């Protein structure tokens, strides 16, 4: 209730938290069931705050930052147990969020290499680890929500949408909903938002 406007964003979040059912067929294999939402906008438009709210209000969620993560360590790791003396896989960040939601910030600032590690998950919702003699497929049926800044400091409404977004189209086609937000300067809205923010403090 402390965020002004963005009503359609709130409706989209509500529909995403309780998305559709998954489908399995004896011949059609598997069909994806949930919704992923990506938002892009110029700075200081209350995206990270909404992300924190979604973290707080969800049944299960994991917070992730683009810069402070490694794709190989995001899915699984190899660690040797001190007691048994053998090496066993340790669950990564996204595997822990099975049947949950993952929020990633600074997505456009996240390394290109690790991006493919995300795309695999967006392909079949399953990660395959084949390293050091372990061959296993781990289920990860989570939904991902991310917010990214345009290539420039501010959004250019006169340019190609592909030009403003640094991410390749291959992964952008996966997201069901794409939202672009801008802080258009208007004195009426400025006064309303100023009154609201002062009321909150």
């Amino acid at each position: 209730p402390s965020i002004y406007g963005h009503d359609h964003i709130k409706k989209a979040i509500l529909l995403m938290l309780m998305g559709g059912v998954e489908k399995n067929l004896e011949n059609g294999s598997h069909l994806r069931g949930d919704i992923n939402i990506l938002m892009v906008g110029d700075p200081s438009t209350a995206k990270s705050q909404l992300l924190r709210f979604v973290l707080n209000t969800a049944s299960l969620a994991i917070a992730t930052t683009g810069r402070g993560s490694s794709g190989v360590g995001l899915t699984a790791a190899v660690t040797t147990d001190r007691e048994t003396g053998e090496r066993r896989l340790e669950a990564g960040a996204m595997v822990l969020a099975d049947r949950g939601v993952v929020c990633i910030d600074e997505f456009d600032k996240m390394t290109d290499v690790d991006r493919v590690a995300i795309h695999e998950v967006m392909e079949q919702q399953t990660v395959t680890i084949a390293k050091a003699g372990i061959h296993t497929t781990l289920n990860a049926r989570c939904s991902v929500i991310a917010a990214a800044n345009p290539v420039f400091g501010q959004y250019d409404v006169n340019r190609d949408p592909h030009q403003n977004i640094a991410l390749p189209d291959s992964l952008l086609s996966r997201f069901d909903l794409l939202f672009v937000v801008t802080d258009d300067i208007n004195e009426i809205r400025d006064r309303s938002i100023s009154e609201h923010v002062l009321r909150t403090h």
Partner: protein, 86 residues
């Protein structure tokens, strides 16, 4: 301290974000550098529209005199359309 006034006045600077609403305000009456009629307040200053003003008779409305101004703000420009002055 007047008995009647306990409606409340509004500072000039608080007129920026609202329009199509009546207001009451007072301040110094004078001419701007451009040559129009303006009201001054410690908060700020606005312009005056006189074309439909009915003044309270019995006074010498002279520049430099405090006047109570009632009218409707318009954010299309900066014109405060005064409906009465006393």
């Amino acid at each position: 301290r007047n008995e009647n006034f306990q409606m409340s006045i509004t500072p000039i600077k608080n007129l920026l974000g609202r329009d199509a609403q009546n207001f009451l305000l007072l301040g110094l009456l004078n001419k701007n550098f451009k040559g129009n009629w303006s009201l001054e307040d410690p908060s700020g200053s606005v312009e005056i529209d006189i074309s439909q003003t009915i003044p309270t008779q019995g006074h010498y409305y002279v520049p430099g005199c405090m006047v109570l101004v009632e009218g409707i703000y318009y954010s299309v420009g900066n014109k405060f359309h005064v409906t009465s002055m006393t």
